[PDB]
């Protein structure tokens, strides 16, 4: 109900209170008590300040300020995330008397090596620089009983996983591990069976992944949307495409305009009956047409691999919806495109979602490589 329900020390509660947090979110409800126990955690949740707090709060509770050694290591893939994370740490740990330091591949080694001679309780860094400082023995991790990976999937790829294992070699054998990700697939199974011990799993996201899907956006005014869409329809080697709209009416209007444009398509939305929707879905699945126009529809069925281009005619408001539209269920990727039409008012949600899902939505280039959505 409240953060005091977790039996946190006064200063930590003060920090949380000053940050404006009154009611703990689901990720915090799940991760905070378990982490304080000492049990390992493997969590899937969309990125946020509240999630970062979901691991930072336990860290600040466990870390003893009287012990001037690195007691917690937070691994992040990017320097931006390192800065953000450390900001959260210093904010929430304002009254804790706890020191936090960022070390990344960007900053110079000399200054960080000098800084490590001072007291550092919590270390936030990127794999390369951290392994470097650890190998040079500048960073003593003999009492680092807490290990945390945010955006862990970005650091468990073929090359980074080795570095992570090397870094793990420095920590004490009995150490707690908190792993966080926004995408379910993880490359190595032995890594987790070896390094995670009876972990507590948290799954707060829909079982979908944006793996393999190349995502672009395009700054487009409403009046220009149809124009841009048709241009795409001629530019792209579409096999099958699904177009998403934010309301039933817009679905029908867009479908009509598409049909009049000299293109074949179906349409499905929430106002129809389940039978009609199943009919449209089954018909489209058999490749009867090339294009389908949907509103947001719950209970999505079975993945259609023919669909190699998905277009958000209307950009959604939440990451849940974006993932429900674009994401696939396969643990392996899917070679396909996701194209988002961004108006002015959509711009913020373009940023937010991109941050929340830990993905990349770049600006649509002049010409799109065919190797990205066309299979052989």
């Amino acid at each position: 109900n409240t953060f005091e329900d977790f039996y946190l020390k006064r200063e930590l509660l003060m920090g949380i209170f000053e940050a404006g947090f009154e009611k703990p979110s689901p990720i915090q409800e799940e991760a905070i008590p378990v982490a304080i126990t000492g049990r390992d955690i493997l969590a899937r949740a969309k990125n946020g300040t509240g999630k970062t707090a979901a691991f930072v709060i336990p860290t600040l509770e466990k870390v003893k300020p009287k012990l001037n050694k690195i007691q917690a290591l937070i691994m992040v893939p990017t320097r931006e995330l390192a800065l953000q994370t450390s900001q959260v740490v210093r904010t929430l740990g304002k009254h804790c008397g706890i020191s936090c330091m960022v070390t990344t591949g960007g900053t110079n080694l000399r200054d960080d090596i000098l800084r490590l001679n001072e007291t550092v309780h919590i270390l936030v860094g990127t794999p390369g620089r951290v392994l470097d400082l650890a190998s040079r023995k500048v960073a003593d991790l003999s009492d680092c009983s807490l290990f945390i990976m945010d955006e862990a999937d970005k650091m468990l790829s073929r090359d980074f996983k080795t570095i992570i294992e090397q870094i793990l070699s420095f920590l004490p054998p009995t150490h707690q591990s908190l792993l966080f990700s926004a995408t379910f697939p993880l490359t190595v199974d032995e890594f987790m069976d070896k390094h995670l011990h009876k972990p507590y799993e948290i799954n707060l996201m829909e079982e979908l992944t944006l793996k393999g899907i190349t995502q672009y956006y395009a700054f487009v005014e409403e009046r220009q949307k149809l124009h841009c869409l048709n241009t795409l329809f001629s530019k792209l080697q579409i096999n099958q495409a699904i177009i998403f709209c934010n309301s039933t009416n817009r679905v029908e209007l867009l479908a009509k305009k598409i049909t009049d444009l000299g293109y074949s398509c179906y349409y499905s939305h929430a106002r129809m009956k389940q039978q009609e929707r199943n009919k449209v879905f089954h018909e489209f699945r058999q490749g009867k047409v090339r294009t389908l126009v949907c509103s947001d529809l719950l209970t999505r069925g079975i993945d259609i691999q023919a669909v190699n281009v998905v277009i958000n005619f209307d950009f959604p408001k939440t990451a849940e919806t974006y993932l429900h539209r674009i994401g696939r269920s396969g643990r392996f990727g899917h070679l396909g495109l996701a194209i988002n039409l961004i108006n002015w008012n959509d711009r913020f949600n373009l940023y937010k979602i991109e941050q929340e899902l830990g993905t990349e939505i770049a600006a649509i280039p002049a010409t799109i490589d065919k190797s990205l959505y066309v299979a052989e």
């Binding site: 029908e252 009509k256 649509i364």
Partner: peptide, 30 residues
Amino acid sequence: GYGEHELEENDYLNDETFGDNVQVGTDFDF
């Protein structure tokens, strides 16, 4: 065209998108 359902929030600007003056082609520049 056909819409004519109980309108919802994002329908408020459909006239901008599906207006008679709305340009169509393959011209669009990125």
